[PDB]
Design a protein that fits this description.
part of a larger assembly, 5 chains, A alpha/beta, D mainly alpha, E mainly alpha, D: rod-shaped, E: mainly alpha, 1 helix, rod-shaped, binds adenosine-5'-triphosphate, binds adenosine-5'-diphosphate
Chain lengths: 529, 415, 107, 40, 42
Amino acid sequence: DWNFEKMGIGGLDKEFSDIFRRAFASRVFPPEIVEQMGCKHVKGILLYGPPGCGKTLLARQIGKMLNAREPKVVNGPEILNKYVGESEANIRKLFADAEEEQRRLGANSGLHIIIFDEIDAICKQRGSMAGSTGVHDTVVNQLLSKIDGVEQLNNILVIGMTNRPDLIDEALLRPGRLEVKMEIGLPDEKGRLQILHIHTARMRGHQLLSADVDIKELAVETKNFSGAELEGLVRAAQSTAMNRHIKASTKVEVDMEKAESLQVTRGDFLASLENDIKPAFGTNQEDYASYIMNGIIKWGDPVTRVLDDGELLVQQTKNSDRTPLVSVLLEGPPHSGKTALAAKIAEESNFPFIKICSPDKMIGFSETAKCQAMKKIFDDAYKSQLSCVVVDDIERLLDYVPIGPRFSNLVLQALLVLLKKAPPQGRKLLIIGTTSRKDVLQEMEMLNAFSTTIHVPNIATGEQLLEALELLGNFKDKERTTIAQQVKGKKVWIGIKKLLMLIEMSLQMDPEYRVRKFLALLREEGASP
Amino acid sequence: DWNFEKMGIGGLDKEFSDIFRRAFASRVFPPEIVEQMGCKHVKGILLYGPPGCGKTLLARQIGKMLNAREPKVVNGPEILNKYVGESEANIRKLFADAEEEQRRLGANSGLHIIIFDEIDAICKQRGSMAGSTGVHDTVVNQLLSKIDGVEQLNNILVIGMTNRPDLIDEALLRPGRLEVKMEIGLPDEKGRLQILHIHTARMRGHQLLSADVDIKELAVETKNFSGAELEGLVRAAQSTAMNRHIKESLQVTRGDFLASLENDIKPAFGTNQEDYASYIMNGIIKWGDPVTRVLDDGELLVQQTKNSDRTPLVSVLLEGPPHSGKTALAAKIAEESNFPFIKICSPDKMIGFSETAKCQAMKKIFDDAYKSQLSCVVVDDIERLLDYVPIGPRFSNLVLQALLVLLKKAPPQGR
Amino acid sequence: DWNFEKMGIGGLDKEFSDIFRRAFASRVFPPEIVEQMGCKHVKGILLYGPPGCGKTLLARQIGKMLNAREPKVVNGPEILNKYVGESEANIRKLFADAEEEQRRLGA
Amino acid sequence: MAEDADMRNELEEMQRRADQLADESLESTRRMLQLVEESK
Amino acid sequence: NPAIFASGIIMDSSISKQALSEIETRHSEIIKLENSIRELHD
Ligand SMILES: Nc1ncnc2c1ncn2[C@@H]1O[C@H](COP(=O)(O)OP(=O)(O)OP(=O)(O)O)[C@@H](O)[C@H]1O
Ligand SMILES: Nc1ncnc2c1ncn2[C@@H]1O[C@H](COP(=O)(O)OP(=O)(O)OP(=O)(O)O)[C@@H](O)[C@H]1O
Ligand SMILES: Nc1ncnc2c1ncn2[C@@H]1O[C@H](COP(=O)(O)OP(=O)(O)OP(=O)(O)O)[C@@H](O)[C@H]1O
Ligand SMILES: Nc1ncnc2c1ncn2[C@@H]1O[C@H](COP(=O)(O)OP(=O)(O)OP(=O)(O)O)[C@@H](O)[C@H]1O
Ligand SMILES: Nc1ncnc2c1ncn2[C@@H]1O[C@H](COP(=O)(O)OP(=O)(O)O)[C@@H](O)[C@H]1O
């Protein structure tokens, strides 16, 4: 009675087709022909990927489809025991029935499945702790000797699932023991559509779903959501919709007669997206609201030029093919407001994965840790079809101090090597860095790694200052005219982040003393162009 | 016979409402409608926050609210053992009854509860660490496989507690696992009023509370008092009232509350009054205009940092010749600030420390400073922190970098 | 009974009176009024000072004052053991009698 | 240890059982011989 | 770090197994034989 649609898996067509072709293709073709070829059968499958993508579900579904004996299961390190020579017999007890039936019924026997769960807990590399821990060298040897030894078995099939494919023993993955190796990754738009349809079919069956909810918009809206988080979203929406009909939860639980007319509307979905579920490889709006703390205002010509140069770079990295890796350096004097512009460029890129590597989260770390955290952020970005990674305050990241000078060399080498490592074939990446001292970076031979440079200016003319004040609008007409009369016939040299603080400091005096104090502060700051 | 009033919890209305909405809202709706949606049930809750704010109380009340069986308790790291293969057995023994009942009955089974205490002493991140001590990896793998494995369980509920939400493994905090994360923080005025009403109800019933004590005043005179210090205040007041009848008409009066508030209870996130007595040793003397000028400037800065919204973080440096009296004036400004949370970070309490210890101490002070609607922190005698000496020169780089990073970091939203 | 001097401690005048007032005032008052009030009992105290000034003696005397059972003296450095789950086991052995007796005899 | 202690105590009780059985068989054999001698 | 396990090896084998051994069933028949020859002598 098997049917693929009954399986209930969406977005994994290619993986399942490959598994079926390589594993179950030779157990369905007529035996008479298969005998003329003299080919043995495959006896292994390995599945790996990041958390929450649909491995265990695939293993369970494969287990259910086969008209054979009930599968055995092993939950993590369930086999270990404290008596010498008792942690191995548990290994041998799994293959006994298969051995006996192969001996008895010859070549017409059935199929016996086994499912190792979290296989990286008992099958780590041999000779890694001076002979291992004493009990992690005998188990591996027993498993290797049993899967493929002097005596031949032909009716087993072993499945493994693991999050870390790097630690599994090498002798256990050759083409004779665990031949098929599959990676289960995040889905694209069609996968999300299929998953939502699979998880909403039942509700739509009984007319419990409203008519103003359109699945395509939800599919487009959720970018880089793992498999489990869509289900979590649907569950949260259902719970929020059901919570309406419990009126007196505070005093006593009571249910109304309007429970029959229960329907789920789009508002529940929007609320669930806004408050409950937060992805892991996606993005959320807290960080942008934390970095762009006062918006962006057009106080002159330069801002549009900078934004246009960012847009050109984004378009190039999206379309081109020869160059999959491009980078750019934003530079300027201090208190000029450059990290906000980088954040705005990244936000307007509209790429799926956008992350900010800032020193705010590396207080007290030694060099080894800075290096390893940088590596992790740059590894997470190799598992998406598009990306954009921002580096902040390259000066503070190296621990640079003018005396000596003194800084860290290991971190600098990590950076210099990490700006030329192309991603795996078929993906693109964009790196933006910000700094306030170009000459120091020049002396380290670090401007050769970056591809292009952009300059961020200050306020340098009275009209621009007046325009900025008008846009902020803290001073009214008369005081503005007085300020214009005072400053319109000179040159100024000030940054925006300092202008805000000067205005705030000036506002604290008496109502009739603000302008003079502001002018005194502006004179005191000093120009030194 | 359950109703919210009898739980004995105050100041946590929204958190409990959200927990109820997301965890229990589908176990009380008619089963017929539930089955037509085919929705599984949530399998975990997590609670974190500073000490003495009411986590274990909430867990206990949840445990004894339901019609479930007796909740199993794990008191910290009591599952560890010295023989290979014994910790995992202890982990596996907790879920046996749920599996057996599920197999026997099906969808009609009751409910089970497991309560881990101090979960962060077992489930640390499964990093490589050149091969972790099995204590971490094996136990964590067993727990992960048991919570959500090949076989389906649908009648369990797992609750956790921790003070360090950073250390826990990420694969253990995804939907389908401990997915309801809640933060329990300090209460505001309404919370203090509710707590005081809860903890002084029995006395009022038997006419033991004098008519002069007004709770609304105590709700105002205590700022940044945790949940667990108000009870201490009340108990101290009662003890002071009782000791007066040792050499039938017993009663509790305002003077007892005032004395106990002034001498017995010392909040951890509040203002201290001995530091100013230790640093300002001979008062302040007006010998000219400069003192008044400095104090006026400090007042202006305080008012700005209190009233503005585009400048949530302010700074100022007091400098001059030696033997001039800077620390006293800084302490005076801080005292006149009238902020709920005031602190001093001086170098004479870190005698003999290395670089990393100093970094950790500074970070800990600022972390506490980030949990109040207002704050004020004094860093005095900077050149001693940096470990400066003219020959060379020599100093510490780690401390300087930490300070430079911390001088421009904004607090959470609204503070 | 207080009589700080009769017990065998001299020079501890205030550091005894404050202890008695704050901590032990709800153990000797008639149980009816204590139950009517609904106040729990303090769960411990801390003593710090220079060595050889009479701390352990005060602890034993306090224990004997309240008709309590035999105290379980423990030394801090002696609890540590080099295997996994041995120090915790030692720390968890001291609270057995209290749990058992409360579970049996109620309140 | 309570589990092992109690199970070993049942094992000791079982040792007493075995001793009783053996002694009973021996006494039965002795009476056996006595009667068989008597008949002649 | 101070964290290491241990493994045990058992010196356990003693007086014959529990009464699943043949001692009791062996004891059974002797009483029947006693009955028989008591009959004969009487
Ligand atoms: N392709 C998919 N289609 C539908 N549901 C899916 C899919 N992938 C995952 N899910 C949902 O994810 C839930 C749990 O996922 P699953 O058991 O596969 O986790 P896993 O990622 O293999 O586990 P872990 O990473 O924790 O070891 C399943 O019950 C199902 O609801
Ligand atoms: N056009 C603008 N460009 C940049 N920042 C702006 C602009 N308009 C307003 N701002 C505000 O100015 C502030 C910019 O400060 P920012 O964090 O960019 O400083 P910075 O130049 O990186 O500082 P530093 O060099 O001291 O590390 C933010 O509050 C931003 O909201
Ligand atoms: N919100 C509250 N309402 C009423 N009483 C409270 C509240 N929070 C705490 N208390 C009182 O203070 C006590 C604090 O103990 P509790 O076990 O809640 O502390 P905790 O903060 O969870 O513990 P820890 O920091 O040790 O993990 C509670 O038992 C109760 O007596
Ligand atoms: N107007 C005043 N300003 C400052 N200190 C005063 C004033 N009047 C009296 N004093 C006393 O002067 C002393 C202040 O010395 P303080 O410890 O602040 O010096 P300092 O500048 O930190 O010293 P140094 O840096 O040289 O070690 C205190 O005793 C304070 O009571
Ligand atoms: N206040 C005191 N009055 C009389 N004797 C005292 C006093 N304090 C300490 N001693 C003497 O000191 C001895 C040991 O004190 P000890 O309990 O070892 O103090 P510590 O706790 O500092 O070790 C006691 O036997 C006692 O005779």
